[PDB]
Design a protein around this ligand. Structure first.
Ligand SMILES: [Mg+2]
Ligand SMILES: [Mg+2]
Ligand SMILES: [Mg+2]
Ligand SMILES: [Mg+2]
Ligand SMILES: [Mg+2]
Ligand SMILES: [Mg+2]
Ligand SMILES: [Mg+2]
Ligand SMILES: [Mg+2]
Ligand SMILES: [Mg+2]
Ligand SMILES: [Mg+2]
Ligand SMILES: [Mg+2]
Ligand SMILES: [Mg+2]
Ligand SMILES: [Mg+2]
Ligand SMILES: [Mg+2]
Ligand SMILES: [Mg+2]
Ligand SMILES: [Mg+2]
Ligand SMILES: [Mg+2]
Ligand SMILES: [Mg+2]
Ligand SMILES: [Mg+2]
Ligand SMILES: [Mg+2]
Ligand SMILES: [Mg+2]
Ligand SMILES: [Mg+2]
Ligand SMILES: [Mg+2]
Ligand SMILES: [Mg+2]
Ligand SMILES: [Mg+2]
Ligand SMILES: [Mg+2]
Ligand SMILES: [Mg+2]
Ligand SMILES: [Mg+2]
Ligand SMILES: [Mg+2]
Ligand SMILES: [Mg+2]
Ligand SMILES: [Mg+2]
Ligand SMILES: [Mg+2]
Ligand SMILES: [Mg+2]
Ligand SMILES: [Mg+2]
Ligand SMILES: [Mg+2]
Ligand SMILES: [Mg+2]
Ligand SMILES: [Mg+2]
Ligand SMILES: [Mg+2]
Ligand SMILES: [Mg+2]
Ligand SMILES: [Mg+2]
Ligand SMILES: [Mg+2]
Ligand SMILES: [Mg+2]
Ligand SMILES: [Mg+2]
Ligand SMILES: [Mg+2]
Ligand SMILES: [Mg+2]
Ligand SMILES: [Mg+2]
Ligand SMILES: [Mg+2]
Ligand SMILES: [Mg+2]
Ligand SMILES: [Mg+2]
Lengths: 119, 154, 121, 161
RNA sequence: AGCACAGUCUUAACGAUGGAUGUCUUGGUUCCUACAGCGAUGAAGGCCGCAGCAAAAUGCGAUACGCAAUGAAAAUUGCAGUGACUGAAUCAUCAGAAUGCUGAAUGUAAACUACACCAAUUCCCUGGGAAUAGUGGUACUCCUACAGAAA
RNA sequence: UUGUGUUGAAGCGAAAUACGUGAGUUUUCGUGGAACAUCUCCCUAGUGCAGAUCUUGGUGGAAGUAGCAACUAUUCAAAUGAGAACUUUGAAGACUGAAGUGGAGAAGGGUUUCUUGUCAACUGUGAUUGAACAAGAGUUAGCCGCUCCUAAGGGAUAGCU
RNA sequence: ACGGACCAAGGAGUCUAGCAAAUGUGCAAGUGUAUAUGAUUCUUUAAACAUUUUACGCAUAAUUAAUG
RNA sequence: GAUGUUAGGAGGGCAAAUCCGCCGAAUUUAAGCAUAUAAUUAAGCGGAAGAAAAGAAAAUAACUAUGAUUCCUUUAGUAACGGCGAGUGAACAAGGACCAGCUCAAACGGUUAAUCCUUCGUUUGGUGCAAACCUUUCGACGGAAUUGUCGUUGAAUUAUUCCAUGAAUGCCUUUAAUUUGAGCAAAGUGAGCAGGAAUGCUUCCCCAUAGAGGGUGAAAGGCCCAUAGUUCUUUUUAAUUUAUUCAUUGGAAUUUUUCAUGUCGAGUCGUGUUCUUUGAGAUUGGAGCACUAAUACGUGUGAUACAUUUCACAUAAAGCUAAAUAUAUGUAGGAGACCGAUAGCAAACAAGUACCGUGAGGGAAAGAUGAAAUAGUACUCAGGAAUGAGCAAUUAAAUAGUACCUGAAAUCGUUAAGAUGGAACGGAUUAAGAGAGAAAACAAGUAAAGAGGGGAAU
């Protein structure tokens, strides 16, 4: 019945080892269930949950390392890329949208939309 | 308004004359209890209603501004007149003057309790009591359309 | 009422009541605390837990005090120590009382409860 | 058709039901619009949400006598006012490149109006405190106290009508 | 212990049959408001699964009626089992992880779990040591850049 | 607007020295178990049914009637069981008569197969039987096929429309 | 002659556009505040109120193919 | 030009209510029908967005002229079209909503592409626990580009004044709102009656910026959730506060005076002809084909073809652009003088489900016990069993027993009464029965004495 916060500290190899053990345990439980038994039939669920948790932890760890590896460097694996709606991705960056022609920019600089309190 | 395609979403058609059944359109195919049954038509289970209600019915009624003003004036006059007020159902047996005028101090009252007290002092105690009594559960299906209680107008 | 974001609609309200999540159920199964308790804390009503001792005001047993054995969020009923009743078979089960019909005296107090009290204050 | 009634001219031979708009939303729509306007005003702190339009005479033999707000001031009028078009645009005034003057009197009137508007208006500096004179047409930036005083007074919308 | 003929029809009482009426109502309905694209980063749709005792629906995806994390916060319960005395039992939220096979389906195919070819691929530890026939990729059109050939 | 309700509302069934020319209204008893009125005025409507070979759902007379007549045909004893003409076993007598209700397969079906149960309904009679219901269980290939090839053909590549 | 075995529920001149006369009402050579704005309007408030510190409709004039 | 599983990328499909193109009918109306009408509609196919499309005048007007589109009110059922039949049918103005303008091409700049992009980088910042973003300027190595990128919007030259700039020191305050999630949140669980149980009926209290609504064993402001109101935090966006110094590169608007009269979109407009579309009429737009222009003194509108000439207004044949406006689709809220299980979506329920159809498709029926099944029928007897019965049993109530609220009618059963010679029923008028009944169908008051209730006088 191991929980997440205990597993974050453990090295990856150790985690893997734990996972395999859990799997083995689960297998045993399954076997028992298959045979004419109902003694530990309810224990299996917990084990499964634990296994899942372990997997999640390991996956997260893997992801983190991957992220670390691919820091910056322009292009990145599409998974590590900021996954967002396709349309949004397609869409120009706000800066790009803003970017006016030089003359226009100059004009803007010259005569901005001033505030002109009327009394 | 009833939905636009209500009762008419069916492909049902009439079998014609020589099958020994009325000539209302009939649901096609088989297997279902619905198959073979009368389709649309106001008389048919699951049919469309007669003249289905529509959003374009005239709901509001324009009234001459002048007419409205006149009505308002009349109402005001009625309110002034003690007898009329009495008739309308308000318990006015204990009020000196029925054009009721009270000091500007009222506009500044901050507490419902205080207001109630003031009312009582005026002579409307009976009226207040009546009002209290008269919150009652409506007869009918109104109960189910956010009109649960009925309350008389004070 | 005055805020037009929350529905008054009766049907909607009923739906909400019936289909409320567990937390919501817990929240709405609150009970009035005794006069002394009220005096002690700025709280008027608390969500009843397990080891709270309650006194029943409404129903057939309108004065029988006792600790709560179990609370049931599925049926909105709490079960007291000695509100026992035999079924048809003869099996003894607790009579379920709605938290509205009950006023709590002795309070089960954990850190969470303390926090809640503080918040209320 | 029967009896002495007018001959029926109700054009409902097309699938008209397919295109009926009932404006249940009228009053509410109006309210929404008002709210939006208010919001805009708030955003544009102090400044008036409305832009200056010149008075102009309506076309055709039948509306000739009447005068109404036209969109945009015409270069000539701007010049008369002593203002650049761009500057005018930046401030409260609409400019109209396409409009032309054939009435000297009208032009004069327009320029008078412009002058009046200018007189009315006080210009908040672009950067805080730093009081600097305008470009081409734009008047001057007043001090802080004056601005405050102006704010304290009610912003009139008499010119924009 | 006796006594009514029987049947057909009628009336009344009390029943059957049926589900009308009445009363409800977690549904609909129209209107109003508000926002409003998902997809080769593999969508919608469809299969296949997944629970201890598990059909459907609901929920989810080989971590499979849920994982992590956050906010609550002692229960969950048909039984079995699991927890409290707060990352744990249960909700809610959901941003992280994960997301079978398919399907635009995109290697060629398709009443196939058929078949190619190019990478062997993957994980562990701080360059070795383990693994698995397993995992990727390879469509058509196009664009920019590059490449080396053609005229 | 001014009221009736768990000392029982609406509804329903029977009525009533009841009222109304009449639609109806009102009341009593019985059931019922929660709402109900307005005639004070008027406002609004998906507002009143005996018919439409009306729609839907129900129910009759017909009527315990027609009928349960292809495939030559059963009988005795015993067993199981609450109960046996149609479950099982034995003994007869019979038929199918290798162009077979026999073996295998294909299409189609999809667990109908098998064992242990077993009878609410179904098995147009009965039924303890069952292709029913319930619980399980069962289909093992290098050689038998598919998988490969081409056929009539099909879907596409280049184009061109 | 047709429809109706029986019973229960459902089941059919409605709604909008413009015109008409009838009658009610307000105002009346005028009338209707259209959109839209404004508010110390915001459960009801999608209504009610208000109408800018010569809008348009119909009517007030007819007639003629017509410049008129 | 091919070619590449080269490096980096994009398109395909789903979804449609509004939206934009295409393509495209017929029923129908004309009391027939053929032009018309339906209708530039449905279906078909293709494409977008939160809106789309339209849009910055080759516009209208003929005025004292207006000044991009869009949308609303209106013009207007008007001009017009139409077997001048049925029918159809705009636009300008006017009042509003909202208001926003622009940049390519061409002219100019060669004492020089001043541009642009891929890849590899380099170092100051700001947030966040991370993940990540957010910006800052600077060069390489490539390319692209002279078949043309970028600057300028005629060109200089004067006066005026702004705007960018960079560094030091400097401050980050007070509120108003606006929008998310949050808490907190007034006062009876008082007698008595009846009840299974008050939230009821009396009566004594109160609270209300909360008497919306829901729950709770019957109608509850005071039992609970919530509600009125506030106290934070979230979203941004106004106002207020603190800017001060030094460096110069660049630019802009006017304003003088010179000099330059530039440029302004071609198989395009236009005409002829065909078909379509239009209210468009000797053709409104569009399209196919044939012919095929003019340079701003141009050429295109100015609703009758044409010639000769005025005049007014525009500047076509390149492009972009917010606002108002529309939404029967999807999700999420809020509503109703709406519907109340044959109604309302087809679907209140394991409904687009079962089931039917080879298939395209078609497509149901089906809600309610009670307050509480943590009261779902214990036990005994008879039964093969179902069931039944109980002296038994849960309930307030089982003729509330899960086919469960109420339980109508048809139909059928039991009992009783009656009637009965090939119908029955009915109306009119009695009759005998059999039920019902007393509020007109007799008895006010007076007296003796019980049980209650009142009101008043002092
Ligand atoms: Mg319907
Ligand atoms: Mg009713
Ligand atoms: Mg007899
Ligand atoms: Mg967790
Ligand atoms: Mg937690
Ligand atoms: Mg493939
Ligand atoms: Mg094959
Ligand atoms: Mg009634
Ligand atoms: Mg009707
Ligand atoms: Mg009938
Ligand atoms: Mg009739
Ligand atoms: Mg029938
Ligand atoms: Mg048989
Ligand atoms: Mg033989
Ligand atoms: Mg033979
Ligand atoms: Mg055989
Ligand atoms: Mg068998
Ligand atoms: Mg049988
Ligand atoms: Mg068997
Ligand atoms: Mg079976
Ligand atoms: Mg072989
Ligand atoms: Mg081959
Ligand atoms: Mg071939
Ligand atoms: Mg082909
Ligand atoms: Mg006939
Ligand atoms: Mg007949
Ligand atoms: Mg019939
Ligand atoms: Mg009826
Ligand atoms: Mg009239
Ligand atoms: Mg597409
Ligand atoms: Mg065509
Ligand atoms: Mg015709
Ligand atoms: Mg005809
Ligand atoms: Mg279409
Ligand atoms: Mg799109
Ligand atoms: Mg656009
Ligand atoms: Mg218009
Ligand atoms: Mg007119
Ligand atoms: Mg037309
Ligand atoms: Mg009740
Ligand atoms: Mg041009
Ligand atoms: Mg046409
Ligand atoms: Mg004109
Ligand atoms: Mg455009
Ligand atoms: Mg229905
Ligand atoms: Mg009772
Ligand atoms: Mg009963
Ligand atoms: Mg009931
Ligand atoms: Mg019943």
């Amino acid at each position: 019945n191991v929980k997440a916060y205990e597993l974050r500290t453990l090295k990856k190899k150790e985690l893997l080892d734990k996972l395999d053990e859990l799997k083995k345990e689960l297998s045993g439980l399954r076997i028992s269930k298959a045979l004419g038994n109902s003694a530990k039939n309810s224990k299996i669920h917990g084990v499964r949950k634990n296994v899942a948790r372990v997997l999640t932890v390991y996956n997260q760890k893997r992801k983190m390392e991957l992220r670390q590896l691919y820091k910056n460097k322009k292009f990145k694996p599409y998974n590590l890329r900021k996954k967002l709606t396709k349309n949004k991705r397609l869409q120009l960056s706000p800066k790009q949208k803003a970017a006016m022609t030089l003359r226009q920019k100059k004009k803007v600089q010259n005569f901005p939309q001033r505030k002109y309190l009327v009394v | 308004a009833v939905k636009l395609g209500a009762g008419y979403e069916t492909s049902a058609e009439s079998w014609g004359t020589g099958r020994a059944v009325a000539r209302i359109p009939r649901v096609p195919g088989g297997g279902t209890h619905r198959a073979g049954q009368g389709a649309f038509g106001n008389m048919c289970r699951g049919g469309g209603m007669f003249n289905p209600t529509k959003i374009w019915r005239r709901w509001g009624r324009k009234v001459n501004l002048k007419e409205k003003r006149y009505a308002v004036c009349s109402s005001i006059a009625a309110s002034g007149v003690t007898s009329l007020v009495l008739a309308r159902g308000h318990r006015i047996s204990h009020l000196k003057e029925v054009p009721l005028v009270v000091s500007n101090d009222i506009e500044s009252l901050s507490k419902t309790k205080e207001a109630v007290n003031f009312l009582v002092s005026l002579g409307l105690k009976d009226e207040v009591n009546r009002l209290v009594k008269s919150k009652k559960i409506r007869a009918g299906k109104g109960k189910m359309r956010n009109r649960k209680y009925k309350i008389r107008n004070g | 009422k005055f805020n037009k974001q929350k529905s008054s609609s009766r049907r909607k309200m009923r739906k909400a009541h019936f289909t409320a999540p567990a937390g919501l159920r817990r929240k709405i199964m609150s009970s009035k605390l005794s006069k002394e308790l009220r005096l002690k804390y700025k709280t008027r009503s608390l969500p009843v837990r397990k080891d709270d001792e309650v006194l029943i005001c409404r129903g057939h047993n309108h004065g029988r005090e006792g600790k709560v054995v179990k609370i049931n969020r599925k049926r909105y009923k709490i079960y007291v120590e000695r509100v026992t009743r035999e079924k048809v078979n003869g099996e003894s089960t607790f009579i379920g009382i709605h938290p509205s019909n009950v006023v709590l005296t002795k309070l089960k107090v954990d850190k969470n409860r303390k926090k809640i009290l503080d918040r209320k204050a | 058709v029967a009896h002495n009634n007018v001959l029926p001219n109700v054009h409902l031979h097309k699938w008209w039901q397919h295109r009926v708009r009932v404006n249940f939303s009228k009053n509410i729509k109006k309210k929404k619009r008002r709210l939006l306007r208010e919001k805009r005003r708030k955003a544009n702190g102090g400044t008036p949400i409305e832009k200056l339009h010149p008075i102009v005479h309506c076309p055709t033999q039948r509306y000739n006598f009447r005068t109404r707000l036209g969109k945009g001031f015409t270069f000539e009028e701007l010049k008369g006012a002593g203002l650049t078009p761009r500057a005018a645009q930046t401030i409260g005034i609409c400019y109209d490149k396409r409009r032309k003057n054939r009435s000297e009197e009208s032009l004069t009137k327009n320029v008078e109006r412009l002058l009046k508007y200018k007189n009315s208006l006080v210009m908040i500096p672009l950067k805080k405190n730093k009081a600097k004179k305008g470009i081409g047409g734009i008047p001057a930036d007043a001090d802080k106290n004056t601005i405050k005083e102006f704010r304290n007074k009610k912003p009139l919308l008499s010119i924009f009508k």
